[PDB]
From a paper:
Alkane monooxygenase (AlkB), a membrane-spanning metalloenzyme, converts straight chain alkanes to alcohols in the first step of the microbially-mediated degradation of alkanes, thereby playing a critical role in the global cycling of carbon and the bioremediation of oil. Reflecting the catalytic plasticity of the membrane FADS-like superfamily, AlkB selectively hydroxylates the terminal methyl group of straight-chain alkanes; other members of the family introduce either double bonds or hydroxyl groups into lipid-based substrates, respectively. Here we report the cryo-EM structure of AlkB, which provides a distinct architecture for membrane enzymes.
The FtAlkB structure consists of a transmembrane domain (TMD) and a catalytic domain. In the TMD, six TMs are arranged in a tent-like shape with their cytosolic ends apart from each other, creating a large interface to accommodate the catalytic domain. In FtAlkB, two iron ions are coordinated by nine histidine residues from four conserved histidine-rich motifs. One iron is coordinated by five imidazole rings while the other is bound by four. The coordination geometry for both irons exhibits some characteristics of an octahedral arrangement, with the other iron appearing along the axis where a ligand is missing; this leaves the two iron ions separated by ~5.4 Å. Second, no bridging ligand is observed for FtAlkB, whereas sMMO has carboxylate and hydroxide groups bridging two iron ions. Interestingly, we found an elongated tubular non-protein density occupying the vestibule. We tentatively placed dodecane into the density based on the length match, although the density’s molecular identity cannot be unambiguously resolved at this resolution.
Author numbering:
A (entry chain A): 19 to 398
B (entry chain B): 3 to 121
C-alpha cells in the first residue's frame, strides 16, 4: 500500500526542453547543414509521438489520502520557477542570432527558428497556467512575468474567472461546438478573451472611484513588460528582426487556441429546470494518460480532474479510465486539428458515442444547426 | 512486512484528552518523518502532525497548542497525546509515514493506513 513514484528523477527534462531552438542553432552552425534549425518541430511531432507509443501508458495514479502528502515536496515547484527565466534567454539570444548573422542565413532558416521559438512559447503559457491557479503572492506575480514574454498577460483574469465559470457552455468562447473548424473557431476565440477581460476588470473597479485606466488593473499590468521588451530588443538589434518576432508571437497564440479546442470539444452541461446552469462535472472534459507527453506538458492531459479541483499542484492530479478518452497524446491530436475533415472522420463518432447520441447534451455549432441535426440522426 | 498498526479510538467528553500511536515495522532505511493527517467531514485530508529525524514540528495552525507528537521508544514508534477535545474537530485519522534516499536519489517512499475515528 504505497505510492512509489515512477517519473520522479525525470522531471528535470523540463528544465531541458525550453532550450531546444538554441542548441538547435549551435548544432546547425557547427556541423554546417541546414535542417538542424527545424529540430523542435521534429522532436514535437515525430519523435515524441513515436516515443509515446514506444513507452506505453502511465502506471502512476496517486490515491486519495496522499494528496496532502504530495503537496509538500517543493521540488515540483522549484522546477517551475526555474523555467520562468530560461524563456527570456531563448527569445533574446535567438533574435541576436538572426541579426548578428542575417548575411549568412537563407529565409528557410528564419522561418524555422521562428517556429521553434513559437512552440517553446507554448511551454511558457503551460508554465503560466500552472502558476496562476495558486493562492500565494509569489506564484501570481511570477505568472504575470512569464506570460508577459508572449503578450498574453490577461490570460490571468480570462482563464480564471471566465473559463472556470462557464466551461462547456454556449457562451464560453473557448468551448468548441461540434461541427466547427479550428479556423472559424480561432476567429470567434481570440477577440473573445480580450473583450471579455477588459469589460471584467472595468466593471470590477467601477464600484469604486479609481478610474478605468488605473495601476491595479491586471490586464494592462504586464503590457509594462511586453512594451519595453519589444521596443528595446527591436530598436537595438535594428528594425531587421520584425519579420521573425511576429511569426513567433502568432504561433504562440495558435498553440494556446488549439489546446482549448481539443480539451472541451463538443461537450455540454445540462440545464436545470427553469433555473441556471449545472456545476461542472467529470464527464465534460477530454483527457489522456500517455507518458512522455505528460512529462513535457505538466500533467495537463488529465483535464477532468483539473476542473474537478482547480487548486491542486501537478503532482496530485489523478487519472480516470472510464471518463471520456482521447485516442492518443497531444501532439497527434494537434496534427489532426489543423486538417478538419479527418478530425471529423474520427472525433465526430467518438463524441456522439461518449456524450449520449442525443441533442440535449451535445453542443452543436450555432450556424448550421438544422443540417447538424437532420443528418447524423439525433433527437430533440 | 511493511504496514502501520495503531491504537487509540473511542468517545470522550469535550474537554478531555487522548493519545494516538501507530507502530510500523520492517524498516531497512533510517531517513523519514512519520505524521498524522485528519479528514473532517466534507474536508480534503489536511495535515495534523509529522516529525522529521531531527525533530521539527509542522502542525496545521488550528491545532497549535493542544496536540503534541513524540517518539523515544523501540524503533518504528511515534505518539500523539491529544487533549482539549472540541466537537468542531471530529474526524478520521490516517497515520502516515514517509522515507528518503541520498539527496541525489531522494526517492520518497510513501506508506498509508487509517483508523481510530475520533469521537
Ligand atoms: C512544448 C509544447 C507546448 C504546448 C503548449 C500547450 C499550452 C496549453 C494551454 C492550456 C490552457 C487551458
Ligand atoms: Fe479547461
Ligand atoms: Fe485551469
Amino acid at each position: 500500500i504505497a505510492y512509489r513514484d515512477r517519473k520522479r528523477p525525470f522531471w528535470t527534462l523540463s528544465v531541458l526542453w525550453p532550450v531546444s531552438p538554441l542548441i538547435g542553432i549551435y548544432l546547425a552552425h557547427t556541423t554546417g547543414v541546414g535542417a538542424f534549425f527545424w529540430l523542435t518541430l521534429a522532436v514535437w511531432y515525430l519523435i515524441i509521438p513515436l516515443l509515446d507509443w514506444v513507452l506505453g501508458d502511465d502506471q502512476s495514479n496517486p490515491p486519495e489520502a496522499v494528496v496532502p502528502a504530495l503537496e509538500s515536496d517543493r521540488y515540483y515547484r522549484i522546477l517551475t520557477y526555474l523555467t520562468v527565466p530560461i524563456h527570456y534567454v531563448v527569445l533574446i539570444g535567438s533574435a541576436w542570432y538572426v541579426s548578428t548573422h542575417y548575411g549568412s542565413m537563407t529565409w528557410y532558416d528564419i522561418l524555422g527558428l521562428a517556429l521553434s521559438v513559437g512552440i517553446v512559447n507554448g511551454l511558457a503559457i503551460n508554465t503560466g497556467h500552472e502558476l496562476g491557479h495558486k493562492k500565494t503572492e509569489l506564484e501570481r506575480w511570477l505568472a504575470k512575468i512569464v506570460l508577459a514574454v508572449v503578450g498574453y498577460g490577461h490570460f490571468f483574469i480570462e482563464h480564471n474567472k471566465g473559463h472556470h465559470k462557464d466551461v462547456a457552455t454556449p457562451e464560453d468562447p473557448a468551448s468548441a461546438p461540434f461541427g466547427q473548424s479550428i479556423y472559424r473557431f480561432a476567429l470567434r476565440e481570440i477577440p473573445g478573451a480580450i473583450i471579455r477581460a477588459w469589460n471584467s476588470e472595468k466593471e470590477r473597479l467601477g464600484r469604486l472611484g479609481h478610474s478605468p485606466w488605473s495601476l491595479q488593473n491586471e490586464v494592462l499590468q504586464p503590457l509594462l513588460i511586453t512594451i519595453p521588451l519589444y521596443v528595446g530588443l527591436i530598436a537595438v538589434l535594428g528594425v531587421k528582426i520584425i519579420p521573425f518576432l511576429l511569426i513567433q508571437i502568432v504561433f504562440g497564440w495558435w498553440q494556446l487556441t488549439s489546446a482549448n479546442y481539443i480539451e472541451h470539444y463538443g461537450l455540454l452541461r445540462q440545464k436545470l429546470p427553469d433555473g441556471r446552469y449545472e456545476r461542472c462535472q467529470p464527464y465534460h472534459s477530454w483527457n489522456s494518460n500517455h507518458v512522455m507527453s505528460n512529462l513535457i506538458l505538466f500533467h495537463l492531459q488529465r483535464h477532468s480532474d483539473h476542473h474537478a479541483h482547480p487548486t491542486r499542484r501537478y503532482q496530485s492530479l489523478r487519472d480516470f479510465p472510464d471518463l471520456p478518452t482521447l485516442p492518443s497524446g497531444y501532439p497527434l491530436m494537434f496534427a489532426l486539428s489543423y486538417f478538419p475533415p479527418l478530425w471529423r472522420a474520427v472525433m465526430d463518432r467518438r463524441v456522439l458515442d461518449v456524450c449520449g447520441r442525443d441533442a440535449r447534451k451535445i453542443n452543436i455549432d450555432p450556424n448550421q444547426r438544422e443540417k447538424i441535426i437532420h443528418k447524423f440522426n439525433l433527437l430533440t | 512486512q511493511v504496514q502501520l498498526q495503531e491504537s487509540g479510538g473511542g468517545l470522550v467528553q469535550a474537554g478531555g484528552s487522548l493519545r494516538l500511536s501507530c507502530a510500523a515495522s520492517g524498516t531497512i532505511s533510517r531517513y523519514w518523518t512519520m505524521g498524522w493527517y485528519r479528514q473532517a467531514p466534507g474536508k480534503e485530508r489536511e495535515l495534523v502532525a509529522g516529525i522529521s529525524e531531527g525533530g521539527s514540528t509542522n502542525y496545521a495552525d488550528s491545532v497549535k497548542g493542544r496536540f503534541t507528537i513524540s517518539r523515544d521508544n523501540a524503533k518504528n514508534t511515534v505518539y500523539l497525546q491529544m487533549n482539549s477535545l472540541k466537537p468542531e474537530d471530529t474526524a478520521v485519522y490516517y497515520c502516515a509515514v514517509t522515507y528518503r534516499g541520498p539527496w541525489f536519489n531522494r526517492d520518497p517512499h510513501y506508506y498509508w493506513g487509517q483508523g481510530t475515528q475520533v469521537t
